[PDB]
């Protein structure tokens, strides 16, 4: 009958609503996190360490492959140019010889001697000149990018950045998920891969995550100012009308790298940010033990750049949590847990009108 | 040289604008100046569909005008019976960041997708009785923003990678790729004969595409900001666009230009969704200020307001028989209006 099919529809609906109640308990128990950073922020490495404690870093050998292939074809094509390029060093020095030998080697192992062999070739101006004619012959598009990054791929700790996965075509997933738990509290972290750099539409999906993890390379200043682009992006996230209730966890990730430059004279911060010359270290700054005052003054200045944005238009609805960090730190998962505990507690105190 | 190709694109832009000006003999407001107004449209909420945990991004009516599928970013497709408010199916998604959903005209399939860049086809008529994935369509390099079935085997998608694509479902392959937009394509709308479709993108332009030939026939400019929503007029000779510039605009295909702008000085928020009534006299538009405005499509006057959502109206849909309007919202509720 009409009411017999209606009771069959009420019974299928009750079987759905029981399952939806069990799904509701899982959803309210899990804190969702959007991990966001400038491309070379150290983020991806932060995702690697957080995973070994409990798909992006797996593809490090595909980026291994492109740089070597790019070096092979240029030294090989060097012959085929009508004026075969003279290498600035008349002798190969065996760097050219080793690269010839490496041709078509299945499952190459990329030893340290292979890199210095490729490293010294690429700086040779003769090879430098053979790259303007690289347009003439067949070459991969990510040739120069990875070749200028020989230094970075050296280290065995190398985890490729988003821009590295962008130059190659390895990324296929739009959103990478990393599930973990701290103190039996489930966390769902989402990293963005294979989306274009125009973020203004897809960033609206994350208006009700617990926090946006915004990782920044503090060593970036001196991409002219990787740090100013990090500051404009933070400013747009902080002042977007749909993200106006979403808190932002802030990690300044290259504390050790930032440090080597400030001690070196390899920084000159007051060129890209002229207000650093009249900036003083704040009185509530508590530096790490055995830390230089030149490091601490540069460390808290980059923090005060991001806090100058967030103290305007904060209004007690969403909060910025800055952390001085390094990408492989073991404390980091804990720092996310403590900020998410502070976010949930501040949300409940607003609902009781206590904060 | 590209300097002379810059000026060649400028003078073709001059020629098209003068060819549009010469056909502009009289505006739509002057033609419809003496038609009777529709009066105040007073719709009310007849059903409130509760059960989604998080914000709803999309909905699509069934062609039976009774069933509808809604997509929420809790990772669920819920198929509702809008008459009885019973949930018919609850489909867990592999990826929770769904941005679009589509109900197939035969009623046998639903599609959905989002930040996973994948249009997942779900079979609603399996032989055991559960709902399983029949196909995952991979090949977009940006988020899936809109999808619409052409039939059981064909579906057109739009994407954040600035392209649209026609898919063969049983093979999983892209039959046709539709390129030419320079921003994220946010919305598409099929023509009533499904030989054409229009797409609205984040380059403030709308493009009319031929489905079988795969080319852009016409490009429509006039909006100031990103086009979030698009819908054909019921005869298929015109379409309406919703934008972040707080205006709706009506574009005619055969006149190749904008006929009407639906705006108000007290409206400063963007449009997320647009749909026509069955005769095309009313243009319903969802807004960021949590309301839906009913517009007189011929006179550009505001005829009513659908108020009652407590968050952003994300999607809007009119039944094929014209009986009801569904509105989905970021407050996790769907409302049915008459």
């Amino acid at each position, epitope marked *: 009958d009409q009411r017999n099919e209606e009771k069959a529809q009420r019974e299928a609906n009750k079987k759905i609503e029981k399952q939806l109640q069990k799904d509701k308990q899982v959803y309210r128990a899990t804190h969702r996190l959007l991990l966001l950073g400038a491309g070379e922020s150290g983020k991806n490495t932060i995702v690697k360490q957080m995973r070994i404690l409990h798909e992006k870093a797996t593809k490090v050998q595909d980026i291994k492959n492109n740089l070597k292939e790019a070096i092979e074809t240029i030294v090989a094509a060097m012959s085929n140019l009508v004026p075969p390029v003279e290498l600035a060093n008349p002798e190969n020095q065996f760097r050219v010889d080793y690269i010839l030998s490496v041709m078509n080697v299945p499952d190459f192992d990329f030893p340290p001697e292979f890199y210095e062999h490729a490293k010294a070739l690429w700086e040779d101006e003769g090879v430098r000149a053979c790259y303007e004619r690289s347009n003439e012959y067949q070459l991969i598009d990510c040739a120069q990018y990875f070749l200028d990054k020989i230094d970075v791929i050296k280290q065995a700790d190398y985890v490729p950045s988003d821009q590295d996965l962008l130059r190659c075509r390895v990324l296929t997933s739009g959103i990478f998920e990393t599930k973990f738990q701290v103190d039996k509290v489930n966390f769902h972290m989402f990293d963005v891969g294979a989306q274009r750099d125009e973020r*203004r539409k897809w960033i609206q999906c994350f208006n009700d995550v617990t926090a946006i993890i915004f990782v920044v390379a503090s060593s970036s200043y001196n991409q002219t100012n990787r740090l100013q*682009a990090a500051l404009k992006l933070f400013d747009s996230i902080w002042n977007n009308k749909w993200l106006r209730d979403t808190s932002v966890i802030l990690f300044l990730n290259k504390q050790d790298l930032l440090a080597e430059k400030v001690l070196a004279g390899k920084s000159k911060i007051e060129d890209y940010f002229p207000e650093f010359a009249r900036y003083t270290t704040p009185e509530d700054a508590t530096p790490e033990p055995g830390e230089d005052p030149r490091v601490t003054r540069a460390k808290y200045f980059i923090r005060d750049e991001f806090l100058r944005i967030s103290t305007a238009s904060g209004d007690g609805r969403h909060y910025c949590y800055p952390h001085f960090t390094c990408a492989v730190d073991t404390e980091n998962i804990r720092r996310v847990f403590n900020d998410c505990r502070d976010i949930i507690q501040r949300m409940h105190l607003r609902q009781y009108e206590l904060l | 040289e590209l300097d002379q190709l810059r000026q060649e694109a400028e003078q073709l832009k001059n020629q098209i604008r003068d060819a549009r000006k010469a056909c502009a003999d009289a505006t739509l407001s002057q033609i419809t100046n003496n038609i009777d107004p529709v009066g105040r449209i007073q719709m009310r909420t007849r059903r409130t569909l509760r059960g989604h945990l998080a914000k709803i991004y999309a909905m699509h009516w069934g062609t039976d005008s009774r069933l509808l599928v809604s997509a929420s970013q809790d990772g669920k497709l819920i198929i509702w019976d809008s008459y009885t408010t019973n949930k018919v199916h609850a489909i867990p998604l592999r990826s929770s960041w769904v941005m679009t959903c589509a109900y197939a005209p035969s009623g046998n399939y639903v599609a959905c997708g989002g930040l996973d860049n994948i249009c997942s086809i779900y079979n609603l008529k399996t032989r055991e009785g559960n709902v399983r994935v029949s196909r995952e369509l991979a090949g977009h390099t940006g988020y899936l923003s809109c999808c619409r079935f052409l039939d059981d085997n064909q579906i057109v998608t739009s994407s954040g990678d*600035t392209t649209c694509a026609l898919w063969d479902i049983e093979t999983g392959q892209q039959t046709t790729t539709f390129t030419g937009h320079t921003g994220d394509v946010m919305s598409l709308s099929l023509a009533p004969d499904t030989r054409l479709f229009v797409s609205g993108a984040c380059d403030a332009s709308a493009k009319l595409w031929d489905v079988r030939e795969g080319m852009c026939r016409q490009t429509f400019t006039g909006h100031e900001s990103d086009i979030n929503a698009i819908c054909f007029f019921p005869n298929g000779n015109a379409f309406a666009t919703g934008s972040d510039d*707080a205006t709706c605009r009506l574009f005619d295909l055969r006149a190749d230009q904008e006929l009407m702008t639906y705006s108000h000085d007290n409206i400063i928020c963007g449009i997320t969704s647009v749909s026509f009534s069955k005769s095309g006299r009313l243009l319903l538009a969802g807004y960021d200020d949590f309301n839906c405005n009913v517009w007189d499509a011929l006179k550009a006057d505001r005829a009513g307001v659908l108020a009652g959502h407590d968050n952003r109206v994300s999607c809007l849909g009119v039944t094929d028989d014209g009986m009801a309007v569904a509105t989905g919202s970021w407050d996790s509720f769907l409302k049915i209006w008459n």
Partner: nanobody
Amino acid sequence: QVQLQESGGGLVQPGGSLRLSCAASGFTFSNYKMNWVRQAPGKGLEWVSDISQSGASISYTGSVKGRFTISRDNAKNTLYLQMNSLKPEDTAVYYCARCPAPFTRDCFDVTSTTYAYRGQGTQVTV
């Protein structure tokens, strides 16, 4: 149709001066935040300066502070960049870039590679 046409960029000596103009059409100019963005050779796009809708809130990147001046004339629908004390590092294609949505404080994507609301650019060579 949104159109931004930059003008005023030419060869200048180091320490010289140059005034850039961005002729805007196809949108309500006073409703939008406006930006100047530049692209050095071999580099990516870099934000230079912005200005609010009324012209009150003005910010610059650090390397141009004290040297570059941004202004708008809302009646004439035009954006200005007054570039004083030009260095050879200022050699770039300078782009006038509109914020994507009106009446907003956030200004996304204006330095993106294929951003739509950005002019074709004028070459400034120092």
